[PDB]
From a paper:
MgtE is a widely distributed Mg2+ channel in both prokaryotes and eukaryotes. The bacterial MgtE channels are highly selective for Mg2+, and are involved in the maintenance of the intracellular Mg2+ concentration. The full-length structure in the presence of Mg2+ revealed that MgtE forms a homodimer, consisting of five transmembrane helices, one plug helix, and the cytosolic region composed of the N-terminal domain and the tandemly repeated CBS domains. A comparative analysis of the Mg2+-bound and Mg2+-free cytosolic domain structures, together with molecular dynamic simulations, revealed that Mg2+ binding to the cytosolic domain stabilizes the closed conformation of MgtE, suggesting a Mg2+ homeostasis mechanism in which the MgtE cytosolic domain acts as a Mg2+ sensor to regulate the Mg2+ influx.
Residue numbers in the entry:
A (entry chain A): 23 to 449
B (entry chain B): 23 to 448
Amino acid sequence: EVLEEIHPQDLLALWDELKGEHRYVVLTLLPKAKAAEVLSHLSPEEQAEYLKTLPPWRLREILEELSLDDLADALQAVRKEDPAYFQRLKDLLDPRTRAEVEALARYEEDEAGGLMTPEYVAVREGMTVEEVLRFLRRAAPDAETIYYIYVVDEKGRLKGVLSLRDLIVADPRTRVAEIMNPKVVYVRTDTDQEEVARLMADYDFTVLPVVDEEGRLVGIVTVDDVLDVLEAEATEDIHKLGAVDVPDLVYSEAGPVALWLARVRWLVILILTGMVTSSILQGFESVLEAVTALAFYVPVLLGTGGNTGNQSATLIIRALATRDLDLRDWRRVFLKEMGVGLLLGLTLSFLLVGKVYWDGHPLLLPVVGVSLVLIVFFANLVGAMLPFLLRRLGVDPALVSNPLVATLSDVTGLLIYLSVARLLLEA
Amino acid sequence: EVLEEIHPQDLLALWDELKGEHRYVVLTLLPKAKAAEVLSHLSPEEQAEYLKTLPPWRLREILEELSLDDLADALQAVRKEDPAYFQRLKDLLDPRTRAEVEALARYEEDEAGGLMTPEYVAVREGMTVEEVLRFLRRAAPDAETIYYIYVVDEKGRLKGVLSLRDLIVADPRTRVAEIMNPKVVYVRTDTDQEEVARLMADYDFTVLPVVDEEGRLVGIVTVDDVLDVLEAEATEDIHKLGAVDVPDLVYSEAGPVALWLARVRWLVILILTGMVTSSILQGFESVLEAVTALAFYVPVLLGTGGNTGNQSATLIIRALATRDLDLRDWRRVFLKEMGVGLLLGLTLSFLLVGKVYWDGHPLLLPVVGVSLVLIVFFANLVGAMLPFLLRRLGVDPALVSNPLVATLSDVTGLLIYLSVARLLLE
Ligand SMILES: Nc1ncnc2c1ncn2[C@@H]1O[C@H](COP(=O)(O)OP(=O)(O)OP(=O)(O)O)[C@@H](O)[C@H]1O
Ligand SMILES: Nc1ncnc2c1ncn2[C@@H]1O[C@H](COP(=O)(O)OP(=O)(O)OP(=O)(O)O)[C@@H](O)[C@H]1O
Ligand SMILES: [Mg+2]
Ligand SMILES: [Mg+2]
Ligand SMILES: [Mg+2]
Ligand SMILES: [Mg+2]
Ligand SMILES: [Mg+2]
Ligand SMILES: [Mg+2]
Ligand SMILES: [Mg+2]
Ligand SMILES: [Mg+2]
Ligand SMILES: [Mg+2]
Ligand SMILES: [Mg+2]
Ligand SMILES: [Mg+2]
Ligand SMILES: [Mg+2]
Ligand SMILES: [Mg+2]
């Protein structure tokens, strides 16, 4: 009845809200393909778990009816988790498929190769519209998408590319080279995952032709895998911008121990440079014993400075991820931001001073006030550069976390504030 | 002519590296397709700028050879900026085109109606595969995509969906409604772009069918525009993480004044949160004049709380926007982080007391160390649980920014520490 009706992703939606037993049952009963796609959009931890739990006949069925990219991904999860049983689970494949999948597992999960699938539709440059169409009816079962057609030489590498729409409008006796496009856009096996995401999103494509170290066409990447690549990447960016450092972390499926590792690393690294502020506070105990109101304005200056630093840092980190800004821009950016910080200072200060005056200390009112303008102005700029610096260093700018800049602006904040206190105390 | 072999992407790459005059003359001298695609992938502001500056004739060609969701958008930008040259410009638009543009501009640009095209191919079920391929070859020059054909009824409603592959592999004599799909997942007009993005990212689709209340087909949504939507929606989410609050900010073309605005609002909110920290010290001046090592150790605790809260806040906000956590999960989380917030404290404390002892103030380590465990733990929990609440109010929980969590950790941290100092000094 409904077994033929339902669409896997209804089962994918209800998956987060269903008991283990019945789940298992739903993997076993479905038509082969629908179970296969339901397993396809699952977590590698879960994937491994089920490829362990399920019967070897259904194992055969799923493994057989799973696109090669997604297969190799699954098998890879089982290699990392349980190596021996990965090999044993690999003993249930057929020769040609086992072989293609082995040649795919060798690619890197972050590179085109590990995004790519070898079931492209490839033709030689000397057929005709009609020939390619005949081939397309007879070759459409074993293909990921018959929508774009790649034209190759005698040896493997890209020559031309070809829209299905193009053939369908083309005069069936016309040869393909007369209607193909030789300026083919493509990635490499080693190309980083986000470079594919970028290229694909730039050119407004939906299949990108991975080539090998020699140029020979060896796979393709589809935009559908790229979207969850994108989401992966944006999520990594957000995560370490929050100074947590684990690339693939699912919050719902992780124990307090792992969270503790991931957070405690950078929490620690930052807490040390949090101690330097204590020892810096130690050596300025003469201007601090003398006037106490000084201490009554340390948090507000520090925290507001860190805030501003966050703002700039993030506002640039995106603009570098979004590829909106290049390294060579740094100089030009500097000035552009600088003025802003000035205006952010004055304004903020106008508030803080109106409170310093209201706190009842109209004496150090300009110590606080001027300090706040100086702190805003500098923290801001610190925020702007740190990414640029890391770029010329060859490091991920998203490592410039909001908390790192918070602690740094705490240090600079205190130095500015206390030296300004000292200098104005000499008056 | 050799200046006409180049791909518009290439030229868009060198756009940031070209002077205004130069920009204008390249955009004014290209092939219609090229010109209009180039202009199609720019920001609204120089979009509208060049729609204004360009010559009435070239703006007429560009306007024409432009796609219709894109024409809609560009017109909409000139519409935001300058209301008159909007209709003056679209007075160059032909009625068949213009009418469509009219019908598109009415929908809200962050909704599905706002990023849809009407150049889609729809065929009635009473065809045969033969007749539909006939229709495809004959209707292909004006379509956005002929890979998904949409079967409808006499009054216009949606009835089902065909892939061109299903046609191509089907025996041409076959009736259409035989190989079609009546279980066609669609998207409504008022729908949020973000939801659209979610759908198309789930189903591994590339087109989506837009509908009215009645269920009639009004247009389709492409994956490319949904993919720029995804990038936007994201980049907005993370700006919101840095207390910057403008929907689509582009830093490289925003002036010092605009950056100023954007930031000034929340930066101001947060400084008016700090004044409280000032007064909170001020009313504890009595307990604070006794010990100075006390004040020597404040930026460390406060900043640490701010950080822990920053981490938790981030994790949970991300897991919210990713739909990996539901509003009802919060209770679980309150426990989950709890222990963690404890574990992080102790460890960070074992090191902190390490200096409190070493820095020359063995006087009383607990007033600091304990205060660290409490502040780390508490800030952690707060940052962890502010997005939940902000989400249960029908507010974007990406508003729980890292400077906000920091500044709240400044306040709470301070109350924690100076109360612990009041008790352990007495
Ligand atoms: N990897 C690639 N490198 C270069 N060109 C490509 C690549 N992939 C696809 N193309 C090109 O993109 C187009 C894809 O055709 P498709 O019909 O999907 O485009 P369209 O926008 O629907 O219609 P039209 O091609 O008429 O604009 C083809 O013209 C083809 O030349
Ligand atoms: N909006 C939609 N709602 C429901 N189903 C759809 C929708 N759009 C497309 N489909 C279904 O998805 C399939 C898309 O066909 P297409 O050839 O593009 O897929 P493919 O992955 O290339 O190959 P295959 O269809 O053989 O898996 C079609 O069979 C179509 O019926
Ligand atoms: Mg990476
Ligand atoms: Mg892979
Ligand atoms: Mg694009
Ligand atoms: Mg386009
Ligand atoms: Mg795939
Ligand atoms: Mg990144
Ligand atoms: Mg701070
Ligand atoms: Mg479009
Ligand atoms: Mg929105
Ligand atoms: Mg729009
Ligand atoms: Mg998907
Ligand atoms: Mg798929
Ligand atoms: Mg959002």
